[PDB]
C-alpha cells in the first residue's frame, strides 16, 4: 500500500472505533480511495430525520490534499451545488492534514444546520434562508423526505 491508503485505513479504524453521532462511513471494495458515507440530519433542525448519502473522493495526495465531497442524495442547501458538490470551509482554504474523515463528516453535518452565507453555491436556497425561511424549511422537508430513497 501507499502512504495514502494506510492513512485512510487508520481513519476508518477511528471512525469504526468511536463514530460521531449520526455519522457513518466506509470505503468501497474497489479502491479505498473512494468512500460512501451517511450523515443523519442533525436533531432539532429542518434537516431532522432525513438520511443523507454522500461520497468522498480521495487523491493519492491524502492527507496533504483534501478529498472532494458530494451528496448522492438530492440536496437543497446554500452551500451545495447542482451536482451535490459541497462548498466547505475546511474542505478548501482551511484544510488541515490533521483532519480525518470523521472530522470532515462531522463538519458537513453541521453545515446542514448552519449554512455560511458567504457566497452561496445555491443562490435560491440562500435567497430563502434569508428572505423567507418559511419556504426554506418547506423545501428541505421535501429533501428530508427524499433521503429515504
Q: Resolution of the coordinates in A? A: 2.9
Enclosing H/E stretch for 35:
strand 34-40
- Sign of torsion, CA 125 127 133 135? negative
Domains along the chain with CATH numbers:
1-149 (3.10.110.10)
- The β-bridge relationship of strands 34-40 and 51-57 is antiparallel
CB atoms within 10 A of CB 29: 7
65 Cβ partners below 8 Å, 6+ apart? 59, 95
Torsion angle in degrees (nearest 10) through CA of 37, 4, 85, 133: 60
Give the whole-angstrom CA distance, residue 32 versus residue 54. 15
Technique used: X-ray
Contact between 15 and 35 under an 8 Å Cβ cutoff? The reply is no
Is there a contact between 141 and 75 (Cβ–Cβ < 8 Å)?
no
Residue with cell 452565507: 117
Q: Is 87 an annotated catalytic residue?
A: yes
Distance separating alpha carbons of residues 86 and 56, to the nearest angstrom: 11
Euclidean distance between CA atoms 46 and 39, whole angstroms: 14
Annotated active-site residue in 37, 56, 87, 112: 87
23 forms beta bridges with 39
Helix/strand/coil for 73: coil
Tell the residue number behind the cell numbers 494506510, with chain if given: 6
Burial level of 53, CB count in 10 A (0-12/13-18/19+)? middle
Amino acid at each position: 500500500t501507499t502512504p495514502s491508503r494506510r492513512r485512510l485505513m487508520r481513519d476508518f479504524k477511528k471512525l469504526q472505533e468511536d463514530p460521531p453521532a449520526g455519522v457513518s462511513g466506509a470505503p468501497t471494495e474497489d479502491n479505498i480511495l473512494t468512500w460512501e458515507a451517511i450523515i443523519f440530519g442533525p436533531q432539532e433542525t429542518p434537516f431532522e430525520d432525513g438520511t443523507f448519502k454522500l461520497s468522498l473522493e480521495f487523491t493519492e495526495e491524502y492527507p496533504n490534499k483534501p478529498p472532494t465531497v458530494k451528496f448522492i442524495s438530492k440536496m437543497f442547501h446554500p452551500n451545495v451545488y447542482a451536482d451535490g458538490s459541497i462548498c466547505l470551509d475546511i474542505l478548501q482554504n482551511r484544510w488541515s492534514p490533521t483532519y480525518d474523515v470523521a472530522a470532515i463528516l462531522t463538519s458537513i453535518q453541521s453545515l446542514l444546520d448552519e449554512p455560511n452565507p458567504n457566497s452561496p453555491a445555491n443562490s435560491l436556497a440562500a435567497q430563502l434562508y434569508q428572505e423567507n425561511r418559511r419556504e426554506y424549511e418547506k423545501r428541505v422537508q421535501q429533501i428530508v423526505e427524499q433521503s429515504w430513497l
